[PDB]
Amino acid sequence: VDLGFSLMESYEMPAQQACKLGASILLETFKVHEPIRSDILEQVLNRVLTKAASPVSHFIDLLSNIVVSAPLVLQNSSSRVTETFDNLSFLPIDTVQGLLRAVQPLLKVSMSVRDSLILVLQKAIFSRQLDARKAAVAGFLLLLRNFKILGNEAFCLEILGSLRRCLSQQADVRLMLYEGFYDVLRRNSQLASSIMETLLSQIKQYYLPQQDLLPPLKLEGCIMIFLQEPLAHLLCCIQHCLAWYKSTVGFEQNFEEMLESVTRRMIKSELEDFELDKSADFSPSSGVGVKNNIYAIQVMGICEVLIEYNFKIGNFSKNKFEDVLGLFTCYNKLSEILRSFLSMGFVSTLLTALFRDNAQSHEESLAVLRSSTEFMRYAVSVALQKVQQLEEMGQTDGPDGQNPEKMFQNLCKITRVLLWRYTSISISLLCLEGLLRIFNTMQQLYAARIPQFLQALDINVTEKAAFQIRQ
Amino acid sequence: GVFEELLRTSGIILKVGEGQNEIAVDQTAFQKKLRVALEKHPSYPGVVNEFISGLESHIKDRSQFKNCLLIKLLLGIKILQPAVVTLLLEKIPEFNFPRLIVNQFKWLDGLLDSQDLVKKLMQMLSVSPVPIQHDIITSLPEILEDSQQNEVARELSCLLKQGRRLTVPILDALSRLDLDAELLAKVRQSAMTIVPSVKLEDLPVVIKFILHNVKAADAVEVISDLRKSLDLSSLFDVIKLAVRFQKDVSEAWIKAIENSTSVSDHKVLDLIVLLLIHSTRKQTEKVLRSKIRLGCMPEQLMQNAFQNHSMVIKDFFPSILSLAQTFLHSAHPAVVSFGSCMYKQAFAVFDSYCQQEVVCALVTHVCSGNETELDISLDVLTDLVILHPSLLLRYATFVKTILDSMQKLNPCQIRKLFYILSTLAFSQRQEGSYIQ
């Protein structure tokens, strides 16, 4: 055990091999030495909360691995978890989510730990510094999603009100909390009604309800210099919330009416309506210019979200696709002056619709979209950008963007369309770049899943691989 | 009365005297019931000010105010928002009486006129005495909305420039609250300047404040300043906590001693911090060994440092043992002399367990190794029995056991060994019968 512990400090690539070798030894000696469980638990717990000098994520992974094996082991060695909780918001590097997910079995069974953690969260939320506040709200989301509210309904209402008090905060916290709202929305039911009411209250401030005036969005309110209102993420979250509400089946009447009004105004809109019209209107490193850049990137995001929504509801209608083409023309006109908020499933469905969308039921609905080559270029470009994000980072933005199974299925779907487009016979070289990125990314990340993928595009891996090389 | 009838009409009943408020068990239930009832009551627009007079009746009764100790729910009405502020401003100078009012107002419901509240708080603190001013300063970060933090920071800096007694709580509040980067340099300079003039009671808090916020390169130069300013002073826990939570501070300290202390002699606190850093990469130990080999840190001052600084020796044991082990094998006369004097001082540690551990370590060193190590071990033992034989008699069993296992050595070593046994036995003849 002494050697196994010392290897962790020695490692601080063969170093990764040594660290994995220490983790394996500690896991094995915990699995074997039945009487020595408490000593190992105390040692690793003390080492975890010693000092946040460097990243200790592998220690947290070891903590999860050791505690998941023996559930009752944590209960015996309790009352030290609270001491670690007392100073969790000092050097959070995203390890707090892993620690909370690891020690959640301790929290659900014991009420004293829940009370102490709620006290720490109450201390964090009222703190006046952003650095602690971000970790506090991030852990708070995990706390909310951990406990089911199906039948503590009053407790759920009170804690949700406490969360809703946090809406007046900095830009980063507002940006991050919407994903947690979507997760807890999918987890629970009455929380859906309450949080949908809260979102309607939030968006009613900015909606500007009227008719016959250009620029429906009151973007000028959130000028500053620094941004504090990510409107595009807000509209994306609201779109997904309404989609889930319709799927799982009045504020919804107000939501759909407002979205219909804003898209109808948007198609009958031009750059003259916006502050930034054309030609010389902004420049970098200038106050008015850096202001206008924020409006530009924001309204590009809003255009992306409305294209997604209109394609979603517009079930095979020529007028809806014409409107979508209008939004695309506005988006491209603004883009020429100078990430993306699309989802994996939407992008896969769009690519399958555009390429190999052979169906007599279509009344040339896809024919209108297929006319614009820029639309096809943008459609492949977003897929390339998202695949690059998956390669560089662990997971991509958007809903359901961290479940590995959904990502693997979407990649398997996209690869077929790209191969078919290239083989059918610029556009093609972009597809080749995409295919190269898929193959490298799947080699690097999904090691064990290699055979099933080779089954998807159609046993011995070599035969299918040689078939693709022959292709 | 109008207010008394309105209170009992809906929401929460106002029990006269010591009775608790008769309302539902919920914080929002009062806001839903009493506020809605008051809004229904507000059909007469001109009576609300009269109701404010009725509210003054609730302010008139001291027993009613004591029963109020709710107050926050009643004060939450948007229409009567300035009335509560005016009542608080009137009752402030009238008179831990204001502590409850500050706690109720601190982290309370927000208002668009926070600038007016800040100005009123500053005006009250201008005339308020020391403890009320300190309480108001502590409640300030909760009261402040953080949008106007810059002006509050400038006002706090100006007050810190003058108020001698308010430096500690103001600095603590500023450290707790966020601040702009431009004002950070001014805050650091102001805190560093008052270090030689700072009071003893608030010294560790101020030291934590200067050492916690700044994590830049220029603080290394400030460390050089703290090489001089901190030495002028001549709990100790806050420094340890800051160093434990800040390795960059450790690196800054190491670089500061490496660049500056080489041509400015040294100090007792420098050696103590070196020991603390070594206890907590361990490059500082190697740097100190190199400095001692060069001829820095004379042991003559080290003896006085160990004698005077009893808490550091009593703070934690194994630093002295590690230092003695490191200096025992030194190839220079200064290093071995330093180790010998270090063990001689460590034997004076009051801890009986630590004392016997040090004696056991000395016996272990004498047990094997280089002959020079055995010679110096016997030399320090004869120095010890010359100093005090009674203290060594307590652990005489280990010494006798070690002497019994003397397999071989030079005749001088055997002479010295039987000399120490004979001296210990005969000098302790009252209880030395078991050794003879």
Side-chain angles (χ1 to χ4, degrees), chain A residues 1 3-9 14-15 18-19 21-27 29-30 35 37 40 44-45 52-53 55-60 62-73 78-83 85 88-90 92 95-103 105-109 112 116-118 120 124-126 129 132-140 142-145 147 151 154-155 159-162 166-167 170-171 173-178 180-182 184-189 191-195 198-203 206-207 209-210 215-216 221-222 227 230-247 250-256 259-263 266-267 276-277 279-287 289-290 293-311 313-317 319-321 324-332 334 341-356 359 361-362 367-368 370-371 373-391 393-394 396 398-399 401-402 404-405 407-423 427-443 445-451 453-454 456-457 461-462 464-470, chain B residues 1 11 17 19 24 29 37 42 45-46 54 76 82-83 93 98 110 117 124 126-127 129 131-132 136-139 141 152-154 157-160 163 167 169-171 173-175 181 185-187 191 193 195-197 204-208 210 214 216-217 219-220 222 226 229 233 236 238-239 241-244 249-250 252-254 256-258 261-262 264-265 268-269 272-280 287-288 290 292 294-296 298 303 305-306 312 316 318 320-321 324 328 331 333-343 346-349 355-356 359-364 369 374 376-378 380-382 384-385 389-390 392-393 396 411 414-415 418-421 424-426 432 436:
Chain A
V1 169
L3 181 83
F5 271 108
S6 179
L7 279 173
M8 293 323 189
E9 282 83 5
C19 194
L21 166 71
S24 66
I25 296 169
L26 271 293
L27 183 61
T29 195
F30 185 82
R37 306 248 194 167
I40 301 299
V44 301
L45 187 59
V56 296
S57 53
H58 61 280
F59 272 83
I60 307 305
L62 183 63
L63 193 140
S64 174
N65 299 331
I66 190 158
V67 298
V68 74
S69 162
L72 281 293
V73 175
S78 185
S79 299
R80 307 306 318 290
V81 59
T82 298
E83 206 282 340
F85 282 19
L88 64 88
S89 66
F90 194 89
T95 68
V96 304
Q97 293 83 18
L99 192 149
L100 265 71
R101 204 186 286 91
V103 308
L106 193 148
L107 266 294
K108 67 174 156 41
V109 306
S112 59
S116 171
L117 184 47
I118 290 156
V120 175
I125 188 165
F126 291 117
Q129 202 195 325
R133 190 182 293 165
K134 54 163 51 193
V137 64
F140 193 10
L142 194 149
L143 269 299
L144 199 171
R145 101 190 73 165
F147 182 76
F155 182 76
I159 193 151
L160 193 70
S162 67
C166 193
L167 294 174
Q170 307 193 358
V173 298
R174 285 164 177 173
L175 181 63
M176 81 76 77
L177 61 83
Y178 297 129
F181 284 1
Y182 181 65
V184 299
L185 173 54
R186 203 163 57 216
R187 270 284 196 280
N188 299 143
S189 62
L191 294 174
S193 59
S194 54
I195 201 168
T198 65
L199 276 296
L200 188 152
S201 73
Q202 187 66 258
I203 191 167
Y206 299 90
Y207 174 50
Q210 61 89 44
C222 63
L227 181 152
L231 271 293
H233 293 265
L234 183 63
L235 277 296
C236 174
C237 177
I238 296 169
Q239 191 271 319
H240 294 315
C241 292
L242 188 153
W244 189 65
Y245 194 110
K246 299 289 94 176
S247 83
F251 57 88
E252 63 91 12
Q253 290 286 294
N254 185 84
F255 272 113
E256 60 85 20
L259 268 48
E260 182 65 26
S261 175
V262 69
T263 188
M266 187 66 204
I267 51 155
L276 271 46
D277 302 338
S279 74
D281 47 348
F282 61 96
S283 185
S285 74
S286 73
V290 62
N293 294 335
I294 296 285
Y295 303 96
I297 197 155
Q298 287 285 315
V299 75
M300 293 176 71
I302 301 299
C303 294
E304 272 190 8
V305 172
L306 277 296
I307 296 169
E308 173 152 50
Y309 173 80
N310 287 293
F311 193 90
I313 62 170
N315 192 355
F316 292 0
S317 299
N319 61 286
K320 304 296 292 193
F321 299 160
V324 167
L325 188 153
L327 282 72
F328 181 76
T329 61
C330 173
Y331 162 76
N332 196 359
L334 183 63
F341 307 138
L342 273 65
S343 64
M344 281 315 79
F346 181 76
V347 167
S348 75
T349 47
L350 172 44
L351 282 166
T352 43
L354 292 203
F355 307 107
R356 204 220 292 286
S361 71
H362 283 47
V368 168
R370 286 160 179 179
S371 64
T373 55
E374 293 285 270
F375 193 66
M376 331 285 278
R377 275 184 177 154
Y378 168 74
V380 295
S381 278
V382 289
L384 260 58
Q385 204 273 300
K386 295 283 185 72
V387 166
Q388 194 172 356
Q389 273 197 351
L390 210 55
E391 201 196 320
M393 295 298 102
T396 187
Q402 297 191 3
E405 182 65 19
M407 295 298 102
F408 183 84
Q409 292 289 320
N410 290 123
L411 262 51
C412 295
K413 217 170 168 189
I414 287 155
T415 304
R416 279 180 158 191
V417 173
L418 282 163
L419 272 170
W420 159 256
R421 175 52 170 78
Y422 174 50
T423 300
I427 301 298
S428 290
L429 77 170
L430 214 51
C431 291
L432 265 72
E433 184 173 353
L435 285 160
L436 169 54
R437 223 76 71 75
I438 294 300
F439 289 126
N440 268 308
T441 300
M442 185 179 287
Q443 286 283 11
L445 172 50
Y446 298 99
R449 315 295 291 278
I450 291 159
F453 179 74
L454 272 72
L457 314 192
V461 167
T462 298
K464 272 66 169 181
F467 184 77
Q468 301 310 135
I469 300 299
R470 279 188 186 79
Chain B
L117 277 296
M124 180 86 157
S126 194
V127 192
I132 286 156
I136 290 153
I137 290 155
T138 54
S139 68
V152 176
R154 273 75 179 284
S157 85
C158 288
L159 191 58
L160 167 61
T167 54
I170 291 164
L171 285 162
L174 292 173
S175 78
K186 166 215 305 181
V187 166
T193 57
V195 165
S197 55
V205 176
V206 167
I207 291 153
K208 178 190 199 332
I210 191 167
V214 175
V220 165
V222 189
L226 269 286
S229 302
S233 57
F236 209 82
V238 302
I239 298 91
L241 194 141
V243 170
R244 197 192 178 79
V249 173
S250 73
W253 259 118
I254 291 162
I257 60 172
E258 181 56 297
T261 225
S262 60
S264 76
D265 297 330
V268 168
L269 293 145
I272 290 154
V273 168
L274 281 170
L275 292 165
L276 192 149
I277 294 281
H278 174 73
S279 74
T280 52
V287 169
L288 174 51
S290 68
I292 288 154
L294 178 52
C296 179
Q303 174 77 33
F306 204 110
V312 176
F316 68 109
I320 294 93
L321 277 296
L328 180 65
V335 172
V336 301
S337 176
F338 182 76
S340 61
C341 178
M342 172 145 178
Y343 286 162
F347 186 81
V349 171
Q355 180 165 41
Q356 281 176 333
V359 168
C360 182
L362 181 47
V363 168
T364 296
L374 271 53
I376 62 182
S377 84
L378 263 67
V380 64
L381 293 174
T382 182
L384 281 168
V385 68
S390 63
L392 190 136
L393 184 60
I414 303 300
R415 288 155 183 179
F418 292 165
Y419 170 65
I420 183 68
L421 287 72
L424 183 62
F426 278 73
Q436 295 177 336

